[PDB]
Amino acid sequence: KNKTIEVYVDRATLPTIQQMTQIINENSNNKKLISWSRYPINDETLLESINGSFFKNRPELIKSLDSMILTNEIKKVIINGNTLWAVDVVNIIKSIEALGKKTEIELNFYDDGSAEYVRLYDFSRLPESEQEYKISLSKDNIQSSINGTQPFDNSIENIYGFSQLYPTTYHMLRADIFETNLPLTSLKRVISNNIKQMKWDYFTTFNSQQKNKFYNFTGFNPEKIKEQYKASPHENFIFIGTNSGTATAEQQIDILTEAKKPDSPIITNSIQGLDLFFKGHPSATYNQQIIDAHNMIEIYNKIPFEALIMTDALPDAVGGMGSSVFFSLPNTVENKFIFYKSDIENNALIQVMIELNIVNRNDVKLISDL
Numbered sequence: 001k002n003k004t005i006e007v008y009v010d011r012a013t014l015p016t017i018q019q020m021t022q023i024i025n026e027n028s029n030n031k032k033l034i035s036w037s038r039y040p041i042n043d044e045t046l047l048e049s050i051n052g053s054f055f056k057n058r059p060e061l062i063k064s065l066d067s068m069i070l071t072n073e074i075k076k077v078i079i080n081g082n083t084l085w086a087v088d089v090v091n092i093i094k095s096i097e098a099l100g101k102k103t104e105i106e107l108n109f110y111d112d113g114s115a116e117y118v119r120l121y122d123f124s125r126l127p128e129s130e131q132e133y134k135i136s137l138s139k140d141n142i143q144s145s146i147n148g149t150q151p152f153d154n155s156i157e158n159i160y161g162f163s164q165l166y167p168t169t170y171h172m173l174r175a176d177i178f179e180t181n182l183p184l185t186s187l188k189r190v191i192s193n194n195i196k197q198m199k200w201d202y203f204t205t206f207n208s209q210q211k212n213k214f215y216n217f218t219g220f221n222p223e224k225i226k227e228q229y230k231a232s233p234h235e236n237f238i239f240i241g242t243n244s245g246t247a248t249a250e251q252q253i254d255i256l257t258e259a260k261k262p263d264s265p266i267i268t269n270s271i272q273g274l275d276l277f278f279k280g281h282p283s284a285t286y287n288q289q290i291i292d293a294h295n296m297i298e299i300y301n302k303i304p305f306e307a308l309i310m311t312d313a314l315p316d317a318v319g320g321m322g323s324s325v326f327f328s329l330p331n332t333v334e335n336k337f338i339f340y341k342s343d344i345e346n347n348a349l350i351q352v353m354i355e356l357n358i359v360n361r362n363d364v365k366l367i368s369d370l
């Protein structure tokens with residue numbers, strides 16, 4: 001009983017990309033069980049190089065996990081998951097504990113995107129006593145879910161409340177959220193020793209083989225985009241697109257025509273004279289309409305922007321639509337404007353982004369502004 005199994009799960013993309021990067025950085029030979037919704041790995045050479053198995057779904061992964069634990073050889077399981085979707089790690093914990101094999105469990109939660117930060121803002125609006133009360137309930141909430149007596153509510157106090165039960169690290173998009181004007185002292189006390197700031201400078205220390213492993217995992221290689229950046233000597237701008245749940249194609253086309261004016265009263269930070277790139281949202285299907293109307297260099301929409309970040313393929317400047325993308329973007333890239341579908345003072349997404357200095361209050365715009 002000296003073996004550790006590492007479990008990797010995610011429904012989105014950001015935790016997956018960060019999880020891939022940690023696996024590569026650590027280069028451990030522990031057995032790994034992997035289930036990533038957006039990144040099915042069928043590459044057996046890749047999987048063998050990390051000692052991994054891939055599972056198409058959570059119940060299959062759990063089945064293999066449990067049989068391994070039944071061998072009596074498993075000292076510890078490290079579960080790596082998605083904070084918003086902590087429910088998936090709850091069900092993994094439930095299955096391990098049920099077996100009653102005295103398995104050590106340790107947890108790494110990676111933020112999903114903007115949702116955690118919208119929820120943190122909302123939670124910070126609560127009076128302090130109500131925050132403390134919700135927190136007081138969290139340990140029992142989580143334990144009841146693990147015991148199987150109640151469903152799991154992914155409220156702030158619950159998803160950030162696991163360090164009360166297990167050795168837990170929260171890898172956060174912006175760990176410095178607890179150092180803004182938001183009243184979050186109540187939650188900070190719970191997790192202050194359990195927080196890591198997500199890092200994006202791994203490639204600075206990676207050797208070639210590590211870099212190549214990242215390309216192989218993601219199916220992304222930054223060579224084409226890096227050539228596109230340098231093709232012309234002008235500074236590079238990426239427009240961050242959204243999907244129809246937030247904006248129409250026409251509204252984004254209109255935003256781009258306003259931005260191209262050197263003297264807009266709305267978009268004061270002009271994109272005139274820049275090399276313009278369009279990065280579409282992975283789920284948008286109107287990207288060609290926008291790209292054509294503006295003669296923009298296309299960055300394939302299915303590439304998650306965090307792959308651009310991790311591979312150091314960043315532009316000089318950025319602007320566009322309210323998005324999780326802006327939360328992981330390094331602060332060295334200039335943010336010219338963000339448009340929101342939204343009275344901005346009551347908008348949690350806008351306010352958290354202002355508080356984190358992701359965007360100047362003067363550069364926040366509403367789609368109704370054109």
Ligand SMILES: Nc1ccn([C@@H]2O[C@H](COP(=O)(O)O)[C@@H](O)[C@H]2O)c(=O)n1
Nearest residue numbers: 240241279280281303304305323324325
């Ligand atoms: N233009 C965009 C918009 C979103 N995205 C990806 O989609 C994820 C979720 O973004 P949203 O919050 O915008 O839906 C981001 O973390 C990023 O991976 C992107 O890569 N390019």
Ligand SMILES: [Cl-]
Nearest residue numbers: 229232234275
């Ligand atoms: Cl350029």
Ligand SMILES: [Cl-]
Nearest residue numbers: 243244284285
């Ligand atoms: Cl769409």
Ligand SMILES: [Zn+2]
Nearest residue numbers: 232234274275
């Ligand atoms: Zn140019």
